[PDB]
Design a protein around this motif. Structure first.
Motif, PDB file in Angstrom:
ATOM      1  N   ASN A  27       0.760  -1.349  -0.042  1.00 18.74           N
ATOM      2  CA  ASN A  27      -0.209  -0.154   0.390  1.00 18.74           C
ATOM      3  C   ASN A  27       1.275   1.428   0.273  1.00 18.74           C
ATOM      4  N   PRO A  28       1.596   1.695  -0.824  1.00 17.91           N
ATOM      5  CA  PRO A  28       2.171   2.889  -1.241  1.00 17.91           C
ATOM      6  C   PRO A  28       0.897   3.882  -0.364  1.00 17.91           C
ATOM      7  N   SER A  29       0.091   4.469  -0.786  1.00 15.26           N
ATOM      8  CA  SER A  29       0.070   5.470  -0.280  1.00 15.26           C
ATOM      9  C   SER A  29      -0.686   5.421   1.229  1.00 15.26           C
ATOM     10  N   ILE A  30      -0.389   4.576   2.104  1.00 12.94           N
ATOM     11  CA  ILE A  30      -0.697   4.592   3.130  1.00 12.94           C
ATOM     12  C   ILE A  30       0.586   4.996   3.956  1.00 12.94           C
ATOM     13  N   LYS A  31       1.923   4.837   3.202  1.00 10.51           N
ATOM     14  CA  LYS A  31       2.599   5.440   4.089  1.00 10.51           C
ATOM     15  C   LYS A  31       2.608   6.800   4.780  1.00 10.51           C
ATOM     16  N   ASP A  32       1.734   7.751   3.903  1.00  8.24           N
ATOM     17  CA  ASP A  32       2.929   8.974   5.482  1.00  8.24           C
ATOM     18  C   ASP A  32       2.238   8.668   6.360  1.00  8.24           C
ATOM     19  N   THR A  33       0.092   7.889   6.515  1.00  4.94           N
ATOM     20  CA  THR A  33       0.272   7.456   7.706  1.00  4.94           C
ATOM     21  C   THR A  33       0.797   6.977   8.350  1.00  4.94           C
ATOM     22  N   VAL A  34       0.829   5.957   7.741  1.00  2.94           N
ATOM     23  CA  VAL A  34       1.540   4.835   8.977  1.00  2.94           C
ATOM     24  C   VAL A  34       3.273   4.815   9.440  1.00  2.94           C
ATOM     25  N   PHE A  35       4.128   6.226   8.572  1.00  2.14           N
ATOM     26  CA  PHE A  35       5.295   6.041   9.083  1.00  2.14           C
ATOM     27  C   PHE A  35       5.676   6.934  10.659  1.00  2.14           C
ATOM     28  N   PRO A  36       4.850   7.729  11.045  1.00  2.00           N
ATOM     29  CA  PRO A  36       5.165   8.002  12.847  1.00  2.00           C
ATOM     30  C   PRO A  36       4.837   7.009  13.411  1.00  2.00           C
ATOM     31  N   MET A  37       3.259   6.409  13.463  1.00  2.00           N
ATOM     32  CA  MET A  37       4.065   5.580  14.804  1.00  2.00           C
ATOM     33  C   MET A  37       4.891   4.202  14.355  1.00  2.00           C
ATOM     34  N   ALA A  38       4.886   4.085  13.301  1.00  2.00           N
ATOM     35  CA  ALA A  38       5.986   2.749  13.437  1.00  2.00           C
ATOM     36  C   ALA A  38       7.497   3.224  13.908  1.00  2.00           C
ATOM     37  N   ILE A  39       8.086   4.679  13.708  1.00  2.00           N
ATOM     38  CA  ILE A  39       9.342   5.610  13.833  1.00  2.00           C
ATOM     39  C   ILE A  39       8.621   5.232  15.494  1.00  2.00           C
ATOM     40  N   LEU A  40       7.703   6.005  16.026  1.00  2.00           N
ATOM     41  CA  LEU A  40       7.427   6.255  17.059  1.00  2.00           C
ATOM     42  C   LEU A  40       8.154   4.679  18.185  1.00  2.00           C
ATOM     43  N   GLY A  41       7.505   3.798  18.098  1.00  2.00           N
ATOM     44  CA  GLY A  41       7.110   2.037  18.261  1.00  2.00           C
ATOM     45  C   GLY A  41       8.220   1.177  18.413  1.00  2.00           C
ATOM     46  N   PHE A  42       8.898   2.010  17.014  1.00  2.00           N
ATOM     47  CA  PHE A  42      10.712   1.350  17.418  1.00  2.00           C
ATOM     48  C   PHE A  42      11.836   2.098  17.858  1.00  2.00           C
ATOM     49  N   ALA A  43      11.189   3.387  18.060  1.00  2.00           N
ATOM     50  CA  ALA A  43      12.068   4.213  18.837  1.00  2.00           C
ATOM     51  C   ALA A  43      12.090   3.565  20.346  1.00  2.00           C
ATOM     52  N   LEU A  44      10.524   3.724  21.042  1.00  2.00           N
ATOM     53  CA  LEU A  44      10.834   2.897  22.699  1.00  2.00           C
ATOM     54  C   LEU A  44      11.174   1.202  22.750  1.00  2.00           C
ATOM     55  N   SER A  45      10.906   0.553  21.269  1.00  2.00           N
ATOM     56  CA  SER A  45      11.450  -0.831  21.544  1.00  2.00           C
ATOM     57  C   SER A  45      12.854  -0.709  21.363  1.00  2.00           C
ATOM     58  N   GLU A  46      13.725   0.500  21.316  1.00  2.00           N
ATOM     59  CA  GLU A  46      14.800   0.976  21.617  1.00  2.00           C
ATOM     60  C   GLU A  46      15.394   1.066  22.636  1.00  2.00           C
ATOM     61  N   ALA A  47      14.214   1.505  23.297  1.00  2.00           N
ATOM     62  CA  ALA A  47      14.174   2.400  24.573  1.00  2.00           C
ATOM     63  C   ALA A  47      14.335   0.861  25.707  1.00  2.00           C
ATOM     64  N   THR A  48      13.687   0.644  25.404  1.00  2.00           N
ATOM     65  CA  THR A  48      13.891  -0.751  26.118  1.00  2.00           C
ATOM     66  C   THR A  48      14.889  -1.761  26.491  1.00  2.00           C
ATOM     67  N   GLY A  49      15.767  -1.540  25.528  1.00  2.00           N
ATOM     68  CA  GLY A  49      16.955  -1.907  25.340  1.00  2.00           C
ATOM     69  C   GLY A  49      17.834  -0.992  25.578  1.00  2.00           C
ATOM     70  N   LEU A  50      17.737   0.633  25.768  1.00  2.00           N
ATOM     71  CA  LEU A  50      18.366   1.341  26.237  1.00  2.00           C
ATOM     72  C   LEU A  50      18.184   0.715  27.877  1.00  2.00           C
ATOM     73  N   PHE A  51      16.746   1.066  28.356  1.00  2.00           N
ATOM     74  CA  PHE A  51      16.735   0.678  30.364  1.00  2.00           C
ATOM     75  C   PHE A  51      18.102  -0.867  30.652  1.00  2.00           C
ATOM     76  N   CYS A  52      17.262  -1.690  29.486  1.00  2.00           N
ATOM     77  CA  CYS A  52      19.141  -2.532  30.147  1.00  2.00           C
ATOM     78  C   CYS A  52      20.055  -2.114  29.726  1.00  2.00           C
ATOM     79  N   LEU A  53      20.532  -1.113  29.018  1.00  2.00           N
ATOM     80  CA  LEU A  53      21.489  -1.210  28.837  1.00  2.00           C
ATOM     81  C   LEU A  53      21.990  -0.138  30.091  1.00  2.00           C
ATOM     82  N   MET A  54      21.207   0.618  30.829  1.00  2.00           N
ATOM     83  CA  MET A  54      21.550   1.203  31.738  1.00  2.00           C
ATOM     84  C   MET A  54      21.571   0.871  33.429  1.00  2.00           C
ATOM     85  N   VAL A  55      20.973  -0.165  33.076  1.00  2.00           N
ATOM     86  CA  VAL A  55      20.515  -1.131  34.283  1.00  2.00           C
ATOM     87  C   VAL A  55      22.141  -2.152  33.726  1.00  2.00           C
TER      88      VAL A  55
END
Lengths: 224, 37, 59, 54, 132, 41, 74, 74, 74, 75, 74, 74, 74
Positions: free
Chosen positions: H40-68
């Motif tokens: 779905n090429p048309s969905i790109k604009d409205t599927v980019f942001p929450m995907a960005i945020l989601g993998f951002a805090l998925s990485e933040a989980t590993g960052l929490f492990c790194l902080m531990v």
């Protein structure tokens, strides 16, 4: 004249005697040597459009080409069991990655200034998410620069030592077994396989290094 | 053949060169600091 | 099997399957309708307005 | 020609959507298509055959 | 809608025009799917197979010669067919085998013709499976 | 540790390759391009 | 001291075990790009940069594991 | 103190494993993003942001492990 | 004394591994979310609240793991 | 007296990893729920309570191991 | 007798890893169940009983692991 | 024998992880069952005994892990 | 023999893990069998012996692991 410097002289001796020392047919063809580099020259030139294209892809083309040539040649003659390849230290590969990144930012800081800091926030990630992303983005910028240098040199070191370690085993096998046959040619068979891999990986990792350094140039010149 | 048609050699390649110079200044002092000889 | 590249189109594949069912249909099922379905006497001429006249190619 | 009446008739038109655009239908999402059977082009060919026959 | 209605039609004469059905078998390119009430809208290619129309009276079967099995969100099942398999009178083993043996000779005649010949042999073997 | 005659020399190598490519064979590839271009016309 | 260095070594080794996920992740990212180009060859140019972005992020995870291991070593 | 610092190093090495999960997760998010955008090429604009945020805090989980792991080190 | 602290540290380090499941889970939630919104864009509004709800539930499992590790440490 | 509490902490720490599978399983149930809702917007009323039941059930499965770790700690 | 009891603590802690498989098994059976129900709304009356039965069979392994951990503890 | 008993306990705890695989395998079998019956409800009778046999074979691994753990303990 | 018997017990306990792979083997072989037979009834007869051989060899590998674990016990 250290081992690095004399090796570097050997590099340029080979470099000139592929395309600079043919120069006789006054044509685009007439020597299959010419077809070789222009093939590589065309693969990177079209890649330069596909990755750097839009305003100044051809402006910065030679650095990607020269670096690709530098890594390509340094990886060709690196298989012989006595190849003391790049002094077995490979510290310069880290240095090349460091200077490539350090030049990348100065170009970014010169061409964007404070705007270069806006690169850490591509599309969204609002103020609650700004500190998390700028930490990830900025640490990543250090991260892949140092990773690029270490991965190439270590694998060349890893490949060179797995030449020797397996070679010593073959010496042990061919000395102990009296009349049987399947003890040394199979270890020789792996030596044949593991040498093709080391020759192969150097070719693509030079390409991977070419693509990567191209990739970071986009981020410097173009903000996204 | 080798007919020299002028192309950018230094006009636009200055940033990496000055980066290299800034590296060089300090690049030799790092060895001096960690002499260990 | 393959009817797009090896064959012609889905239409030809379906027509061949229909001819399979009709020709292999039992004797009492055979009638005038299946004879008409089997009957085909079209001629493809493909008028050469510019060129390429097919000259009444049989169906 | 449409045989609208037992004696009257007039020409009429039936358009055929291309395979390149049947996949762009606004309601195309509600059909659980599969990329294995290349449903758009087969649908287009079957559509052409049926409407031309009718 | 209440149950499912089947528009099973054949160019010589329509078989069903929305008759209420307890369950439908639709042998397709992927596999047969049982649609009997509501369900979701679907578009699918009907591979030659037994489209058995299960009903409270009996589970009468039909081997299809091809078609498309498509579904509408209003619990509508539009099944377009060409030639059916009425009960079991359609069964005729000898001529099916004769066609299969005589025309597998021309199964390698000419690209398109060869492919169509192989496909017709395959659907003849499908009929043989329906022959029982 | 040892860097003097390699990294500065490395950028000098890049400059030399830059010359012998962009001033020699880029014009060569371009020259054959335009040569055959005018051969057709 | 000797036990301290011994545990430094084992901690670096057990820090190394967090980068298998980084490898698998970059791999599935490239696999999904191959799948998407298979479905939509035209969108390849638009879709490629996110592949390298995800590769860089997973490599960042792997080199965070490297950072822990190396700080445990030297 | 020898065993205390030894096990602190061991615990940090074990803790840094969270980057494995972070990378695998951000990569499956990227894989689904690429699959959907190609489908779905048309969905790109409205599927980019929450995907960005989601993998951002998925990485933040590993960052929490790194902080531990960091607090175990220090 | 020191052995108790050492085992406390190693137990917290092992407990830190519990965030991997949370990461993989939250990421697969957003992966299915991306695939669904790419299939039909209309479903996104009715799935987003419950989507982030399941997201926060997996994050809460991860936070439970982190809290057990913390109470081990403290 | 020290080794017993040391092993209590070790056992609790190695038990805490059980919640990993519980969380990822909850979320894969939820992912299939999302897929089903997307492929059938009219099935939400039927699918939401069952998916919530599976949620709570996997959550209880994880929490029982969490209670095992807790009794290793404080018992 | 502190060492045997310490080791049985460690073994009881180790025995609690089968929770991963038990939970993921419940997860996959319910996931395929919900997918089948959504795609086939008229299959629930026959999939729900076997779905529950398969869930119970999957939970058998987890409950048995917790029972053996309990008997090791006591 | 004291350290032998302690190692018996820890080895039994280690060996109890096979039920994880047994349960996850029987659950993937059940998921395939229910997906197939959702696609074709007619094959349910045919797939029932084969799937029961597969369930028994998959749980045989958990049973073998049980007998190994029992040998370790008693 | 104290340390030797202890190591033998823990070695059997850790060698028990091959049953995980044996069970997953049997399980997805049966799952693919179920999917294939539910998608095609005729091919069931010719796919059944192949699945039989598949999980037979998977259980043979599980038996190899069982034998290796057993020799560490007796």
């Amino acid at each position: 004249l250290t081992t690095f410097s004399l090796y570097t002289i050997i590099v340029l001796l080979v470099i000139t005697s592929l395309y600079t020392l043919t120069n006789n047919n006054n044509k685009i063809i007439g020597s299959r040597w010419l077809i070789s580099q222009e093939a590589i020259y065309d693969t990177i030139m079209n890649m330069t459009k596909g990755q750097i294209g839009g305003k100044n892809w051809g402006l910065y083309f030679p650095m990607i080409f020269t670096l690709f040539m530098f890594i390509f040649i340094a990886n060709l003659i690196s298989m012989i069991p006595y190849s003391f390849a790049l002094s077995a230290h490979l510290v310069f590969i880290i240095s090349l990655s460091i200077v490539i990144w350090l030049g990348n930012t100065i170009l970014g800081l010169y061409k964007h200034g404070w705007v270069f800091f806006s690169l850490f926030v591509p599309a969204g990630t609002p103020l609650p998410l700004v500190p998390l992303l700028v930490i990830i983005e900025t640490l990543s910028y250090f991260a892949r620069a140092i990773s690029l240098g270490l991965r190439l040199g270590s694998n060349i070191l890893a490949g060179h030592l797995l030449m020797v370690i397996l070679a010593g085993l073959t010496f042990n096998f061919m000395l102990i077994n009296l009349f049987t046959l399947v003890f040394g040619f199979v270890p020789l068979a792996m030596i044949l396989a593991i040498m093709m891999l080391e020759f192969a990986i150097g070719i693509i990792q030079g390409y991977v290094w070419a693509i990567l350094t191209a990739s970071y140039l986009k981020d410097a010149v173009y903000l996204h | 053949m080798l007919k020299r048609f002028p192309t950018p050699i230094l006009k636009v390649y200055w940033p990496f060169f000055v980066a290299g110079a800034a590296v060089y200044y300090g690049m030799s002092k790092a060895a001096d600091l960690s002499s260990n000889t | 099997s393959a009817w797009r590249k090896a064959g012609i189109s889905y239409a030809a594949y379906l027509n061949v399957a229909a001819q399979a069912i009709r020709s292999s249909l039992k004797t009492e099922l055979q009638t005038a309708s299946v004879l008409n379905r089997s009957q085909t006497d079209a001629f493809y001429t493909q008028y050469k307005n510019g060129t390429a006249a097919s000259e009444p190619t049989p169906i | 020609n449409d045989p609208v009446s037992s004696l009257s008739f007039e020409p009429s038109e039936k358009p055929i959507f291309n395979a390149k655009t049947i996949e762009q239908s606004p309601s195309f999402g509600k059909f659980e298509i599969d990329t294995d059977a290349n449903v758009p082009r087969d649908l287009f060919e079957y559509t052409l055959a049926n409407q031309m026959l009718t | 809608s209440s149950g499912l209605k089947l528009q099973f039609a054949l160019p010589h004469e329509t078989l069903y025009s929305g008759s209420e059905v307890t369950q439908v078998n639709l042998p397709a390119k992927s596999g047969r799917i049982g649609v009997l009430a509501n369900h979701v809208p679907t578009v699918e290619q009907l591979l030659p197979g037994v489209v058995e129309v299960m009903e409270g009276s009996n589970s009468k079967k039909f081997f299809i010669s091809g078609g498309f099995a498509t579904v509408q969100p209003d619990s509508q099942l539009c099944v377009t067919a060409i030639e059916a398999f009425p009960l079991e009178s359609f069964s005729q083993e000898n001529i099916k085998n004769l066609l299969a043996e005589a025309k597998k000779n021309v199964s390698s005649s000419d690209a398109r013709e060869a492919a169509e010949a192989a496909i017709q042999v395959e659907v003849l073997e499908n009929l043989q499976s329906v022959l029982k | 540790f040892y860097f003097m005659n390699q990294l500065t020399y490395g950028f000098l190598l890049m400059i030399t390759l830059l010359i012998l490519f962009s001033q020699f064979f880029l014009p060569m590839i371009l020259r054959l391009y335009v040569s055959r271009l005018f051969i057709s016309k | 001291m000797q036990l301290v260095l011994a545990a430094k070594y084992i901690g670096a080794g057990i820090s190394t075990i967090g980068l298998l996920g980084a490898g698998i992740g970059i791999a599935i990212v490239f696999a999904a790009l191959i799948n998407g180009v298979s479905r939509n060859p035209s969108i390849k140019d638009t879709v490629f940069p996110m592949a390298i972005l995800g590769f860089a992020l997973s490599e960042a995870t792997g080199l965070f594991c490297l950072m822990v291991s190396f700080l445990l070593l030297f």
